[PDB]
Design a protein around this ligand. Sequence first.
Ligand code: NA
Ligand code: NA
Lengths: 344, 344, 344, 344, 344
Amino acid sequence: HMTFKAEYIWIDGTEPTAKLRSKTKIITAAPAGLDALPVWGFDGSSTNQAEGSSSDCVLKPVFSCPDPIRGGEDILVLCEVLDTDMTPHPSNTRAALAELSERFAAQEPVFGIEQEYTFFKGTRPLGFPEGGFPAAQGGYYCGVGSDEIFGRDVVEAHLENCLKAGLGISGINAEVMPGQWEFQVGPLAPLEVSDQLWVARWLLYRTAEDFEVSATLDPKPVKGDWNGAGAHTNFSTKAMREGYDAIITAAESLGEGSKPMDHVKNYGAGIDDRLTGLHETAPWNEYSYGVSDRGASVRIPWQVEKDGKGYIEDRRPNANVDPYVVTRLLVDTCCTALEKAGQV
Amino acid sequence: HMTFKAEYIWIDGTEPTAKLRSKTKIITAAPAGLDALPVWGFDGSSTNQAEGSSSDCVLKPVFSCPDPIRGGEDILVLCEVLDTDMTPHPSNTRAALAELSERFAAQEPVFGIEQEYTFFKGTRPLGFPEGGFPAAQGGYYCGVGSDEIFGRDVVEAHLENCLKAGLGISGINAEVMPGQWEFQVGPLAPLEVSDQLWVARWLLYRTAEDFEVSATLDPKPVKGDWNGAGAHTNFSTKAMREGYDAIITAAESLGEGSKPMDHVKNYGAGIDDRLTGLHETAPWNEYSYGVSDRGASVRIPWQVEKDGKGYIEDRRPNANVDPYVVTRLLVDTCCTALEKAGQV
Amino acid sequence: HMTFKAEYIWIDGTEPTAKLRSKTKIITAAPAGLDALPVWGFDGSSTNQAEGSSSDCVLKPVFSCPDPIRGGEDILVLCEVLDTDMTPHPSNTRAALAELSERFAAQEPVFGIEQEYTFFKGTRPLGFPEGGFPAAQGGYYCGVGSDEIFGRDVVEAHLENCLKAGLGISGINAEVMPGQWEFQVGPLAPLEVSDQLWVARWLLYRTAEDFEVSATLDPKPVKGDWNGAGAHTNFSTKAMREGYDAIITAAESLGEGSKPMDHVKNYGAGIDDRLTGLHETAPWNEYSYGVSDRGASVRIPWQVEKDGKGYIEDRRPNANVDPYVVTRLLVDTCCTALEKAGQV
Amino acid sequence: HMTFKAEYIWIDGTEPTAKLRSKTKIITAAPAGLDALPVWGFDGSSTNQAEGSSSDCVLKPVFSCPDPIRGGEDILVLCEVLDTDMTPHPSNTRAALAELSERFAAQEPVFGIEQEYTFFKGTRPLGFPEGGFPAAQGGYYCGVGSDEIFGRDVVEAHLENCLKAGLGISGINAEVMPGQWEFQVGPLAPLEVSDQLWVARWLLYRTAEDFEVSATLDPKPVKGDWNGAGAHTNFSTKAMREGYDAIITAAESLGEGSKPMDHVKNYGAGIDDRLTGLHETAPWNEYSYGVSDRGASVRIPWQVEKDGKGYIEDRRPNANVDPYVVTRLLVDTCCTALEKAGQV
Amino acid sequence: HMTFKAEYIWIDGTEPTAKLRSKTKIITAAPAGLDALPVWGFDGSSTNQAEGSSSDCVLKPVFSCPDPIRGGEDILVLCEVLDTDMTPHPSNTRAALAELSERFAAQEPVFGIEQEYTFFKGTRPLGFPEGGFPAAQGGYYCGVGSDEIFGRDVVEAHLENCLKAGLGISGINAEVMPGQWEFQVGPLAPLEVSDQLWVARWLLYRTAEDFEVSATLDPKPVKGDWNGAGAHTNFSTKAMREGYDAIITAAESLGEGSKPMDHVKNYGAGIDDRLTGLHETAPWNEYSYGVSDRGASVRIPWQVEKDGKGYIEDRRPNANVDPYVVTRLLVDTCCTALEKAGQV
Ligand code: NA
Ligand code: NA
């Protein structure tokens, strides 16, 4: 049997937005999926999962895939973080989703996440001239040419790495702001879409190291009329894919009670800076939904309304949202209302 | 079974000159030609097919070829743009040509397009020294050597890419201005010549990104005696290839009525800057045709006149002309006169 | 017959800290393991193993592995240094360890060494800006991304080289200080852990040459709150892996008599700069041990205390400790105390 | 069936020294040698082969070989230039040589050309320091090492390309001036040597583009005691290869009548700058010949005088001579004189 | 039939120190070793083998090997230089050695040469900072790491090149001065060691060209306490390999009569700058020999004295010595004395 490299990847307890951590384990064993991979540990003081004298943390594999960069038999191992007593660590946001995922498995929730990000070279946006601004927006989005496209080599390398890892990438595109890009993950189950997006994020930062650039998931990287970075989330249940009434209930459910504030205060840090009335999308403090409405909080695509079935698009989440969090909330809110409505 | 990349390419509604757009779709299916390729959509506001609050657009594949850059099983997909009701979008200029292509199919129109372009590095022409001018024109055209040739690495990469894509390239050459180049598409039927030229343009910008340079189809990139960039168009019907009388009819039809202004006002933005009396070609406001006359609006090549059959060359179109448009006008004007004349 | 390259590597007599030396021998003989390798010699005057007019030294191979850098049939040969009468040279610290390894072979001592190091470009730390300081520590440790990760290309290259060399590397990680890294060697027998670590160090310096950077094993490369570089050593015997009783015995033995100073004055040059009271760990001048205490001289991990068996961690050795010396001392102190207690 | 690239190369009508021009034709046909290769055309106004209103020029293939740079099935096509009536264009210097070649085919004339050139980076000689002079000549000629050798990478690539092209190269060497080089073509018949040399020149400029340097055939690139660039020509007939009497006849024919100025005024532009009394060879205004005399206009090598048979070397032609011209003149003068003398 | 490149390499008549010259010959023949290779010629005026009006020189192949740089079937041809009458040219030092080799062939003389050299980037030593000095000597010799090792990539390409050439390289190491290196050739017969060392020298300069650095065999490249470059020579005869009495006769013969001055004045230019009293070795004006004496002119290694048989080491020759000269002088002096002594 063989010796291989295992990259253990986890999420820390940094505030307001948590960060990825990883280290390499050299494993000398007979290959098997996930279940044969050892739990591991690290020092919490260094990752804000203590920054104190009593937290030592345990790494528990939850997802694994091939390491496309290292190649060969090497693998990536996404972990959840546990306390020494094997209970979920307070930073752990996966465990809550797993519970809700299981609770609502009958409805078969499916997600697509459109993850945006912006390239930087140091403090400078990669698409910006030093000490200045590029031409106004219009030619960057879905663009071509050196004048309007920045970081394509990175984006292509990242896309190839994600596919080699087996992640469900449906597309990529260049965004409205120069040096701003998007990739779409899904359609997938709530734990699976969330796990893959974190791994895909890890691949983006990591791939970009070789090109000596940085990527940021900051929602408003440059102040002004320059475009924000979102993480639009597409969501449906079997009933929603079957009929239009479920589609309306889900959209209505998000507008009920404290749910608008409940989601928005968990949809990523600095959300007030990105969600303004004037550009995309709607203000963070009011909820709306509509057909083909890019100004609404939630959009129902024109095809969905025509077909009387489909999915809905939540345009509120920031590019820096935790996928474990956004998926949990939408499943908790929408699926609960659908059960009550009998639209299951 | 396989996963492959599809780059969906389209033309936007930008004024005065429309621009290429592209995004990547990841497709998991059994390969089949074009008809099996899914229709797609995009948000028009970002592409001047709204820049408003109401436009959603549909992508309909019309042409496909291998992606020479990605390689393997990856492909390029040229699309036309439709409204949600599947009617042509106002930006769509292919549909009018497709209609005219059908109307005159018995005459069998064929086109060759000589597409010129100029390399730039930022705001600087690639062949120009920073802050200055190179030696006057004369040694650049069909030249050799580092002193007189700029961007050959890009040009060669681009040509190989076109051929791998299966495009009908007949030749390439270095042009009169330093860092100015030409490639020839044809001979082809009107839709095919127009589609392939658009894909070849897209390949040019995209190929040049890797070399950190820009290409421009601006008709007069440098003011003065420096050469303009045209897209000279060669055109014929079966009757023109058979006999000389149809050639004179074709040449005369372009000078009748409002046809000179009708063509010239669709022959690209900034045509007044390129079409001056003094150098190439003829002034934009007067129509002339002649045998072997490079100062004329339309030239009859000396071989065509010797053989009593051949084609004609329209020297008026700018390098920034829409191929869908220039082909449509020539088919409309020339083929209509030939039908009346009985020369079909 | 065939020719292959052999890199003869040794440790000099430099003070306070000894240095690696190497040269290449071209061998035309039939390959066989270690025993067929010729003894060799060198000039001591140049290596601080004379600095006089009478010392000629003999190189005798003790370990060999593939040269991962040269590749093919080429090999690395680690040697010990002997006088011309074939007795150990005064610089030789392996020979003391070899006697003790045999004397206590029944206890089956095993070591793991966590070897930290810092990248430099000239006098500047690789993770530091010129003339300045980076953001405070926190995001570097086990990090990802260009803002926080420096020297990863070297680290992957070094790790792949160690594994190709067949060395027992258990893991690597990015450390608390920017441009600081760690690799873990073990678990291994005392001479074997010591031999492989020296070869791994040589591989680090040599691999880093290709990237035009430097590595240092200096214990406090930057003054202040910036992290020191250590070589934490994990140690156990069969009795220790069997029971908790040996662990207390092992931990107390290190605190008895002159053993704290006996060890500490051999635990690397400049130890007073790294082992300060205020942060990790304990002052270089006081010995303490405790369960899960990162501030102690010796820590008993929580898993070890829970299982009533395991190993102990000596947090005192500097990154510049000689592994032959630190391993010898721990085996000498702990195994002697364990024998007396009957706990073997 | 297959598609391949054909690079049509020709010589223009520029004065005083004509220049190479080239463009690419994409061919989709079954390969066959030269005769199946299409005639082509170009615009003369841009190449000093019109600068007028009546010249359209015809490209007629006369020689072809593989394209060593493009590789595969791609080829280089050397053409001669014709008027539209298929007669030789005034710039065409090949046709005069072809008449004369056939006229004297019984004597079997053969030529070898030692073609010198100098590398430049912009206005700076590649072997020169910026703003200054290198050490005086002596260590450059046939030298080795970075201090004395400049452009070898270009030189090796050019040689490998020529051999891949099938050209008759006998040798290369580094010349007396730094960054000055030589290659030898031959021994060959007059049309072939001239054709191959032109292709070898074209390959030199073209290869050098990739290294971002220039090559010049200027006879005196740097003024002063720095060495000039010549094109020494080796010439013989069957009678000359047979006997010494023909050699004397050949050597004497060049000194008769107006033949010295007749040749010299066609031996390249700026010949007065290179051919001075003081160094090589003899002054441009006097004819001399001698055995082994490098200061003479024409040299009889010592082996030729020893063997009583051989060839002669004309040391007068500049590096910028047209090979079609020098070969025509030497054949015309010597072969005519040999005929009159009866030594054929 | 096939074509291969032959690089003809020779030594010039430059004073005080001769230089390598080379040119390329293109050969079209059936391959065979040495005997099938054509003699060639060159112009002496350019190479200090005339600097007059009467020398044309002949190249006669004496040694050949594969060209490791060109690879494939291409070869290096080391030549000796002859006058046109086929007698040895005055610059030729090989011919003298060939005579003594035959005269003393019965004694079976054998040589090893340790060839030192220093890297330069322009006028600056490669290991020196611009405008200053690096740390004092001690860590460079047999060193590792970017701080102390300079030019290793060149050294490695060169070593691999020499082995591919089939040259007898026994080892390489880094020397006391930064950017100073050594390779050892031998043990071999006098003509073979001398021929291989010249080819190895030629390969070093040539390999170093690709890295854009220079190598020098200057004996004292930086004035002061910085180390000189020598060419230590190991020498033995069959009798010396058999017994110690022969060893003593050889060491004494070198101290007799005019032998110390005869050798020293032929041991390379600038020997007085390297051979000073203070340091290594002995002053150029005094002869001494001793066992293990690094300060003696000639050293008898300790193994030789222990075993009562072996070789001797002449530490006097400069790195810029002609191997043909040092080997001849050593054979003449020692072997002559051994014949008289009856120790043959
Ligand atoms: Na990050
Ligand atoms: Na030299």
